[PDB]
Each structure stands twice: as C-alpha cells, then as structure tokens.
Symmetry: C2
Subunit: 303 residues, 2 copies
C-alpha cells in the first residue's frame, strides 16, 4: 500500500497568505506519512479579471521558489521525503510576448523532495463556458493553452498522469494517459458550484472506471476573497468593480479503479483540509487482469 494526500483549499488573491496555507497542508501530509501530496489548480492565486491574473502571475515565480525551499525545509526537519503536485500560474515567456501572447500559463507543477521541479504541465483545455444560470466565463482571455501532452511521472505512488480541471471533460486525454502507462490520474481543479453539483463526482468516477486508474481530485472550495487593494489602487478600480463572488465546489476525493470513492472531504469545513488514502497496486492489477480493456481496443478503427 502507498499513502497519498489530497488537499482542499480556498485560494485568495494574496500569494503570501496562500503560501502559508499550502505550507501547512504539506507539513500535515508529511506528518501523516503521505508519499505525495496533491493540491488544487490555482493554489498560488485566483484573480478578479484577466488583467489581475497577469499582474499576479508576475509574483508566482517567487511563490514557487519559496515553496521549493519550504518543501526541502520540511523534508529536512521531518527526516522524511515527500513529493508535491500543485497548480500554479506562470507569466508568458519572451517568445510568447514576441508572438503577441501576453497570457499566463496555467501550470501543474510536480516538485520532488529535493525541491526539484520535474514537470510543468500547461493546461490544454481552457474553461470557456456559459455556466447554466450563471456567468459567462472565458479562461482563454487570461490563460494561454498548452501545446504538449504531459509525460507520465514515475512517482513514489506509481505511474502518474497529470491533468487540470476542464481537461477532465475530454475522455481521449485520460485514455491517452492510460495508454502511455498511467496507474493514477489527477485532476486538480477550481470547479464551479453549478457544474460541480451536476458532474464533479460523475466525471471523476467515470474517468477512473474508463481508465482503470486511481483518480485524485484536489479541489478549490468556498467563496474566494479576491481582494487586492494595492492592485485595485494601481488599476484605478472603483468599489463598484471591486466585489468578486467566485465560489468553488470542493468535495475533494480519491477514487479507486473500480469507481469507488475511498476518501472524501468533510463537508462541514469550508477551510483548508487534507484527505488521505492508501493506494493498492494489487487491486489495480487485479481489476486490469479481470477486464483487460487495453488488450481489447479497436485501434484499427479509432485513432
């Protein structure tokens, strides 16, 4: 058995305050002897609008450097290793800017116990949706889409396939990750209330059953405090344009390859929390042996 931790949190626009929460959750994860801890999409910050996002992304590299140090400090002080998967943002590159693309990168980082970044997965499918009885959201206004399929990570838990949030709606992506050798999929997310209530548990369980993988679902939760007086000052924003009522679904969970929820967030808390699960490689292998889906595909017709 291999122990995983999945974090649920409520990001603000304040990267210093978010880092403190992140550090506490990683610290708890090590104390509970989790081999890897998974944190949600946008754990560095959430923003008020596309201009705010670009502003905050300029602060994310320092957040990441501080996180790398915090991880190594915690590993040193606990005499125990942990790896960290965490959603952040990164500013555009020089080449991006040269091409007229000043949008931020929505990135899932994998950081090992030595503070080394092993992967930066840039989100492929961006959240451009008219929410039913809700706001029109267009992630592509602030975020640039990725151009790479993420490599399978050989983590302490097993072979890991990485995805972010709306990526979960595109089954061919999860199928590809399994085809490449994934045993575990993660979907760190900031999921809406409306689509969360409808589809969050369904999609997680569906992906698990489709791919015969463990599925980890770290989610944002609660009403986000997006306030940034210093940026609001700089942007000349009126109090009228200042309020931001973004709310995330939470219900962070761990799902087995048969679609059984084996760990789930406590609904009684809307603050940060950690859930733990023990992953069973023998169960995963048994499930795949009994129903050998990857030996039964019609590649002659599909793809």
């Amino acid at each position: 058995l291999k122990r995983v931790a999945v974090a649920q949190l409520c990001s603000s626009a304040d990267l210093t305050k978010n880092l403190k929460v992140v550090k506490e959750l990683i610290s708890e994860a090590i104390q509970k002897k989790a081999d890897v801890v998974f944190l949600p999409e946008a754990s560095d910050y959430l923003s008020q609008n596309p201009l705010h996002s670009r502003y905050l992304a300029q602060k994310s590299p320092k957040f990441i450097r501080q996180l790398q140090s915090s991880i190594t400090d915690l590993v040193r002080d606990n005499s125990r290793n942990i790896d960290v998967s965490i959603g952040v943002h990164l500013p555009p590159s020089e080449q991006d800017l040269l091409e007229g693309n000043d949008r931020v990168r929505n990135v899932l980082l994998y950081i090992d116990h030595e503070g080394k970044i092993l992967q930066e997965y840039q989100k492929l499918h961006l959240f451009d949706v008219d929410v039913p009885n809700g706001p029109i959201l267009k992630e592509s206004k602030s975020v640039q889409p990725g151009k790479a399929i993420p490599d399978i990570i050989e983590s302490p838990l097993g072979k890991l396939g990485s995805a972010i949030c709306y990526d979960i709606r595109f089954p061919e992506f999860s199928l590809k990750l399994r085809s490449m050798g994934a045993e575990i999929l993660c979907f760190p997310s900031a999921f809406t209330i409306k689509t969360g209530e409808a589809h969050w548990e369904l999609l997680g369980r569906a992906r698990a059953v489709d791919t015969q993988c463990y599925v980890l679902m770290p989610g944002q939760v609660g009403m986000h405090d997006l306030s940034d007086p210093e940026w609001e000052k700089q942007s000349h924003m009126s109090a009228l344009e200042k309020s931001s009522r973004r709310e995330s679904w939470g219900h962070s969970m761990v799902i087995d390859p048969w679609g059984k929820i084996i760990a789930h967030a406590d609904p009684s808390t809307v603050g940060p929390q950690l859930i733990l699960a023990d992953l069973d490689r023998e169960l995963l292998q048994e499930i795949r042996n009994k129903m050998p889906l990857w030996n039964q595909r019609r590649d002659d017709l599909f793809h």
Copy 2:
C-alpha cells in the same frame, strides 16, 4: 418533442417465445405513441454456450423475417408508424465458413416502419471478461449515423459502452442520440451501469438510451440438449441480468427509468427535446474545444 420507447425484457433460449414478447412490446410502444422503440442486446435468444449459440443462430434469420412482417402488420393495424432498434444474432455467412470463421454475429438491427433493415451493426468490442469471442466474431465497421424520427442516432452494443472513443466518434459523426442495448451482469451492473450511461451522455452531450435485459434467465432447451447428447452436469442454463433500463438527457439527468417493482417485460417512455440538446451544446461547446492537434 419526439417520443422514444425503451424496452426491458428477459430472453430465454426459445426464439418463438421471445418473438411474442418483442411483438407485444412493439405493440405497446405504438399504443403509447412512441416514434422509435429500442430493445436490448440478444432479444432473439440467449444461449448456454458457444455450441448452443451456433445452433440458435441458424434460427435467427426466420425470427428476423417474421419480425419484419410483424412490424408492418402492427404499423398497419394501429395506423401509426414506428421504427425498431433491436439486438439479434446472425449465423456466419457461407463465405465466413469457407474462411474459417465459424462464429455468430452479435448484431443491432434498425428496422423502419416499412419493415426494411436500414442498418446491421455488428458488435465491435466483445465481452471477454472475468468469453464472447469463443462464439462471436467482432465487427469490421463503425456504424453510420441513422437519420431516425427522433434525430441523429449513433448505435452501439453493450460492452461497446466501455470504450469512450467509440461514443466520441459517433458524436463527431453527428450523433444526437446514442443507444447501448445490453445484457449486463449483476456485479458490473450494480457498479457501473448507471455511471457509464450518464458519463457517455455528459461526455458526448447526447441523449443516451439504455435498453437492458433483466432478471433470472432460463436458457433450457431440451431439444438441443437431447440432440447434443448432453449430460445434466454440463448444463449451463442460468444467467442473471441487471435491468435498470433508462433514458438519460445530454446533461446526465435520468429522465425515464425502469420500475424496479415490475417483474418481466416493460416499456419506459421519454419525450426528447432537441432545443435542450442544442442549448447544452451552445453553452459548453466541447466539440469546438477538442485538441485534435494532439489527440486526433
């Protein structure tokens, strides 16, 4: 709104008795003003073993021809059109035999109100799980979208539901409605039946139709057993199916579902809403957002 009927039934090894049930369900569907009725996988028969199946499949062409006549009879008697989607078996062709492929075909027929077979979909993914491929030959083709009275229909069978790329392709081809006629086991039924149907609906933004076999089957066939000189120790005449036939909207809402308290053959009805489908697709334009550059 267009009205669909989804049938739930329990096949024996007796094609004559199965035909009677199928005809009654089609009759009931016409009475309830359904424009198309969908029946499960293996509505002609279920078999004890591969040798039994090869024997029963020889009887399937007559079943189909009699069903074709019965559909035109029922349409004409009731003075109302209906189309029929129904899972049957077909024996290997003469050419199949000469090629060494002495296996039956698991086929989904689409039969229109004129009794004409518009599609013969041969199952692509065979149920080999802890072995269908012992008796059954896999299909060679993706089925065309059918322009049905309800809208654009994509067809599949049973285990096919477990391979999301198939359903995704049918949507890419223009499906508005997907069907998964099935004989689903109890163990995987309890675990996955509702999950898989809802997932395919949400994945593809299609109405999903789930006609299932239900209950305990008796596959006894004394005449075959005598001809085969079979010992009673070798009989394998019990099967159990999950039922829970349902209709699911493009948002994953179950809008019709089999009544658990009704034993044996039953129909469920739903009125399909093309405008609802269009609204869902407009608000979350998944097919304008796929990464074909990387995946397709």
